[PDB]
């Protein structure tokens, strides 16, 4: 369970915020994301 993903349509034309939580540090991110249909990080 490394982060979240908070919006109002999880899709670009409106803003949304993500927070990922890498080893180090957590790098909160307020874009317009175009969010894909089931998000997951991928690692090695
Ligand atoms: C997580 O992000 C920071 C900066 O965004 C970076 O320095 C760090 O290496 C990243 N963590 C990993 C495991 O790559």
Do not use: H, M
């Not at 894909?36 to 690692?43: E, K, Q, S, Y």
């Amino acid at each position: 369970i490394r982060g979240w993903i908070f919006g109002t349509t999880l899709d670009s034309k409106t803003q949304s915020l993500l927070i990922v939580n890498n080893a180090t540090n957590v790098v909160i991110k307020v874009c317009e994301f175009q969010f894909c249909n089931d998000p997951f990080l991928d690692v090695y």
